[PDB]
């Protein structure tokens, strides 16, 4: 349901099959977005 539909809504997309690099992907986006409104 959330695959055949276009991504569009997901501002950032997590494509990782392991917890380790999946954590770094979310933290990468949050940290950069954290500095936007400051």
């Amino acid at each position: 349901k959330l695959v055949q539909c276009p991504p569009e809504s997901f501002d950032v997309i997590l494509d990782e099959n392991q917890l380790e690099d999946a954590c770094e992907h979310l933290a990468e986006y949050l940290e950069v977005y954290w500095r936007a409104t400051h």
């Binding site: 099959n17 392991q18 917890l19 999946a22 990468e28």
Partner: protein, 858 residues
């Protein structure tokens, strides 16, 4: 009757075929019409088998009125079986020799299994492109046979006969051709006379007397087995000046060029089949299987550890377990433990000190306990079944299970299988993971495990071929290799295991001409009807070598190409991933042309100079010229470097030139201890030919290409070395201190084998000879690991391996002599080593070279 022909009737007949194949193995061909009770029963069982395959060919005959080849084979087998049985009962030409048709029954095991029929068709359809090479080989054989007929016709019929009569060949036990005083060959000299009239080097079989004999000799030489024997016999016969031009040219043309043609045609056919089957997309299923497994453990561990972060006491129980396995310290600790296990396993040797045998038994138990503890620690922290999911983890689990099974025996016999701790050395192959090419070795194993079904089918067809030819050889030469010679042949067809060993030895091509001569003499001698039996050996050799090539090259080429494609796709996906990740987060005349040449000519002259020296005569007038000729040669190269050394200040080939010229100049002096140092820097004079590199364009290119190829194949070399070391350790466990023997066969200990004993010349009781008793070891033994590595190397080269095999079969107990045919079941070790190393690893290496040359260039 067309109703009961599709129900398990067809499996009942298949089981009937399997029991008419386990009744042709139990049969023992006895010499001179002897028999026993088991044979007396096997006759009646074969009567029953004949009745069954008759009313089953009748049903199909009167059901569909003999067109298909397999059904035609069925019919002919049945009719000749009935004919042979009826004729045997009526006579109760050779009657019993018509039973050779019964060995065609195992050929039906593939007609009832279409899955085997398809691989048989695949093997057969590759014969058509090789018919041109077969015709070329036939033409070359004919031409060389005619040349040998015109050159050495009836010139090897004279041997030394002693100056007292013509009784029998008084020139050693292996007489050789000679020549007269007016001849040019070998001279008998002393108390011997080269008298005409003699059978021949091999009872008159090896010679160029006839066109058939010449053709057989040429074929035997072309097979590269025992061609130096023929060359040396010809040298003794006609002279040592111009038979090398014949034999070396024959070897180069008919054995190396022909092998190159066969390899090229087979590689082209395999590539065409690969490119035709790739269109279907069989690689995609293998490709999609790897990523489905990579994300499997990557998502299961996420589920596993998230449970432990919780929302019984697992917070202080699970973090360390998964943070120690992935800590990079547990990895190196386990690697060190495996290195210690290899150290203690490989330290075993014959007659070791009494402290070592205690150290390596305490350390074995300690390391076993440590590895069991580590396995249990890892077994629960990553899921009981997810731990079983991994590939190498299955190997570890099996190794631990077998080690625990074999370490608790301590009471039973034969503890050689307890050393399955050697397979723990495979676990250290994770050292490839730290380095590169780990995705090139593991991909190969993945492809092998994916194609294991076709691998087993291909290995089963070869086994069926070997079984059929073993049964045929047991029928033809069973109980016939019993002549009056004092020595008993070891490669015979007396039993089924012995026939299997003989057929395997002929397939490897080692000493197959000796077995051919034994078979020829068992049917008379060099005569027209008797010598027609060599067709069996010729066909066996050709067909077996062709089948082995088509099997072991196809497996290697297909699996290696699949692994390389997998690695390329994985590299592409990694590149795309790490690129898309980065695409978002970021936002003097020595330089002349003729001179150079003139000095590459000097270089050639200098290389020619030291090839013309006198190796044996220390002082000879020829070396007077050559020794003083190098003086002026070294001056030119000395002048060349000085004329260049001012131009610059250094590359890697000027270093080699300096290492040559300085060594030569210092060797001009030295003096003092002119025994040791001179004998090192005189052999260091072999670097002059290597100076053609960097001075002749193209030589540098091919040298660099060969270095790149070496760097590419180093991984396969390392894996083969590891397997050889493991097999050497297993062989050390099996045959440590057991391959000793005494010249007197009646003594089985070193203390007993002392003094003198009486021998008889040719076993003539009237001619006794005193000889000293000696406790001797095998030429290549298994006393320690180093002594076993080289024995296994010589076995892999197929050189003298039957002698080692039959020496190891007789060995039974440490420090004691041999027993005839003690453990015939130990030949499985040698068979497995030959199959894995000499057949699979070599063809894998060749296919790797082929693939790495194909993916370069095009």
């Amino acid at each position: 009757i067309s109703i009961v022909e599709w129900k398990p009737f067809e499996i009942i007949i298949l089981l009937t075929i399997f029991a008419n194949c386990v009744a042709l193995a139990i049969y023992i061909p006895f010499p001179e019409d002897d028999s026993n009770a088991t044979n007396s029963n096997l006759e009646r069982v074969e009567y029953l088998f004949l009745i069954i395959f008759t009313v089953e060919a009748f049903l199909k005959v009167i059901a569909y009125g003999l067109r298909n080849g397999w059904n035609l084979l069925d019919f002919i087998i049945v009719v000749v079986g009935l004919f042979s049985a009826i004729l045997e009962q009526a006579t109760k030409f050779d009657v019993k020799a018509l039973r050779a048709f019964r060995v065609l029954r195992p050929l039906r095991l593939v007609s009832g299994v279409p899955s085997l029929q398809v691989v048989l068709n695949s093997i057969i359809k590759a014969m058509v492109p090789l018919l041109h090479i077969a015709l070329l080989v036939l033409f070359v054989i004919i031409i060389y046979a005619i040349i040998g007929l015109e050159l050495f016709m009836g010139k090897m019929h004279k041997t030394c006969y002693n100056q007292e009569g013509i009784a029998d060949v008084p020139a050693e036990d292996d007489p050789s051709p000679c020549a007269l005083e007016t001849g040019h060959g070998r001279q008998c000299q002393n108390g011997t006379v080269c008298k005409p009239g003699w059978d021949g080097p091999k009872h008159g079989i090896t010679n160029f007397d006839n066109f058939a004999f010449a053709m057989l000799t040429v074929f035997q030489c072309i097979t590269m087995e025992g061609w130096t024997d023929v060359l040396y016999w010809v040298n003794d016969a006609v002279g040592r000046d111009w038979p090398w031009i014949y034999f070396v040219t024959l070897i180069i043309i008919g054995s190396f060029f022909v092998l190159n043609l066969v390899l090229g045609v087979l590689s082209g056919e395999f590539s065409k089949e690969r490119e035709k089957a790739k269109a279907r997309g069989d690689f995609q299923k293998l490709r999609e299987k790897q990523q489905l497994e990579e994300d499997l453990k990557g998502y299961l561990d996420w589920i596993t550890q998230a449970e432990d972060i919780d929302p019984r006491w697992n917070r202080f129980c699970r973090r360390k377990c998964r943070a120690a396995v992935k800590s990079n310290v547990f990895y190196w600790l386990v690697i060190f433990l495996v290195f210690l296990n290899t150290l203690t396993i490989a330290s075993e040797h014959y007659n070791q000190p009494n402290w070592l045998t205690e150290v390596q038994d305490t350390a074995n138990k300690a390391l076993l306990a440590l590895f069991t503890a580590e396995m249990l620690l890892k077994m629960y922290s990553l899921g009981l079944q997810a731990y079983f999911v991994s590939l190498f983890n299955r190997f570890d689990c099996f190794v631990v299970c077998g080690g625990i099974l074999e370490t608790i025996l301590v009471e039973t016999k034969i503890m050689s299988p307890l050393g399955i701790s050697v397979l723990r050395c495979v676990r250290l192959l994770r050292i490839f993971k730290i380095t590169r090419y780990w995705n090139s070795l593991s991909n190969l194993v993945a492809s092998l495990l994916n194609s294991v079904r076709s691998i087993a089918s291909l290995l089963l067809l070869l086994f069926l071929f070997i079984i059929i030819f073993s049964l045929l050889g047991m029928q033809l030469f069973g109980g016939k290799f019993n002549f009056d010679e004092m020595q008993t042949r070891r490669s015979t067809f007396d039993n089924f295991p012995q026939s299997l060993l003989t057929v395997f030895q002929i397939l490897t091509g080692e000493d197959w001409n000796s077995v051919m001569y034994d078979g020829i003499m068992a049917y008379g001698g060099p005569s027209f009807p008797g010598m027609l039996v060599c067709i069996y050996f010729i066909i066996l050799f050709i067909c077996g070598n062709y089948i082995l090539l088509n099997v072991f090259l196809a497996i290697a080429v297909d699996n290696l190409a699949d692994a390389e494609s997998l690695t390329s796709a994985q590299k592409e996906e990694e590149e795309e991933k790490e690129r898309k990740k980065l695409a978002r987060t970021a936002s003097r005349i020595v330089n002349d042309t003729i001179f150079t040449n003139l000095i590459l000519f000097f270089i050639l002259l200098s290389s020619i100079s030291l090839a013309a020296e006198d190796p044996v005569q220390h002082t000879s007038f020829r070396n007077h010229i050559l020794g003083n000729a190098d003086y002026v040669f070294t001056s030119i190269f000395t002048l060349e470097i000085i004329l260049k050394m001012t131009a610059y200040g250094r590359n890697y080939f000027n270093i080699l030139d300096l290492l040559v010229v300085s060594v030569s100049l210092i060797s001009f002096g030295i003096q003092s201890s002119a025994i040791n140092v001179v004998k090192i820097l005189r052999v260091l004079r072999v670097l002059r030919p290597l100076r053609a590199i960097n001075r002749a364009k193209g030589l540098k290119h091919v040298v660099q290409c060969v270095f790149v190829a070496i760097r590419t194949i180093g991984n396969i070399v390392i894996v083969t070395t590891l397997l050889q070391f493991m097999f050497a350790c297993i062989g050390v466990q099996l045959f440590k201190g057991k391959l000793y023997t005494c010249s007197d066969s009646s003594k089985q200990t070193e203390a007993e084998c002392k003094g003198n004993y009486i021998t008889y010349k040719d076993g003539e009781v009237d001619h006794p000879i005193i000889q000293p008793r000696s406790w001797e070891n095998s030429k290549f033994d298994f006393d320690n690991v180093l002594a076993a590595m080289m024995a296994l190397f010589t076995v892999s080269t197929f050189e003298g391996w039957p002698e080692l095999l039959y020496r190891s079969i007789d060995s039974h107990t440490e420090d004691k002599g041999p027993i005839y045919n003690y453990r015939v079941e130990i030949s499985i070790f040698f068979i497995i080593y030959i199959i894995i190393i000499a057949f699979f690893m070599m063809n894998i290496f060749v296919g790797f070279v082929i693939v790495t040359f194909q993916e370069q260039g095009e």
